[PDB]
Design a protein around this ligand. Structure first.
Ligand SMILES: [Zn+2]
Ligand SMILES: [Zn+2]
Length: 195
């Protein structure tokens, strides 16, 4: 679910950043590891902010991110003890780079079923598709292994009640260990990375 909006693509892949206060040294090291992971695989670069008007801020705040470059000022990545692991930060940086959740692709109904009977009442909005004008997938197919893909029981009424079920053979969903091959391939196209 790569944004179609050109102004949301950070210029030349440069993403200035600030790390806020109130983190431990270990937490800060994880933020740097997550940035370096993106930099290893794609042409995105993270730059210690000096005077840039628009930048990301790793912000001590409750868990619960703008997609792409908002512009007009800083944008926060909310980090707490329940959402500070490497793979979670890599996912949040996927939002920063320009990705919505994989299940919100306009073509998602070709790939997953949303099991409405199992969604926690009042949490249905989390499963809305992006409008087709908001996403340009760059010719890359739906990626079950994306770091941006929800797990099978996200916002479910029960641990064993799936809210998202792949439609064909089932691929595991919801990994938060590293960027997938598809994430990388698609980020490279979005940022027009040299190859
Ligand atoms: Zn997310
Ligand atoms: Zn994708």
């Amino acid at each position: 679910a790569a944004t179609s909006r050109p102004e949301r693509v950070w210029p030349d892949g440069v993403i200035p950043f600030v790390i806020g206060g109130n983190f431990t040294g270990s937490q800060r090291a994880v933020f740097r590891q997550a940035m370096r992971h993106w930099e290893k695989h794609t042409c995105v670069t993270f730059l210690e902010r000096t005077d840039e008007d628009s930048y990301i801020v790793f912000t001590y705040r409750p868990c619960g991110s703008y997609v792409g470059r908002r512009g007009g000022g800083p944008q926060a990545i909310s980090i707490g003890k329940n959402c500070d692991k490497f793979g979670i930060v890599v996912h949040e940086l996927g939002h920063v780079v320009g990705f919505w959740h994989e299940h919100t692709r306009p073509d998602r109904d070709r790939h997953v079923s949303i099991v409405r009977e199992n969604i926690q009442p009042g949490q249905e909005y989390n499963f809305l598709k992006m409008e087709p004008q908001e996403v340009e997938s760059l010719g890359e197919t739906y990626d079950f292994d994306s770091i941006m893909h929800y797990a099978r029981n996200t916002f479910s009424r029960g641990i064993f009640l799936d809210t998202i079920v792949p439609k064909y053979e089932k691929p595991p969903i919801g990994q938060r260990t590293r960027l997938s091959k598809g994430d990388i391939a698609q980020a490279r196209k979005l940022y027009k990375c040299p190859a």
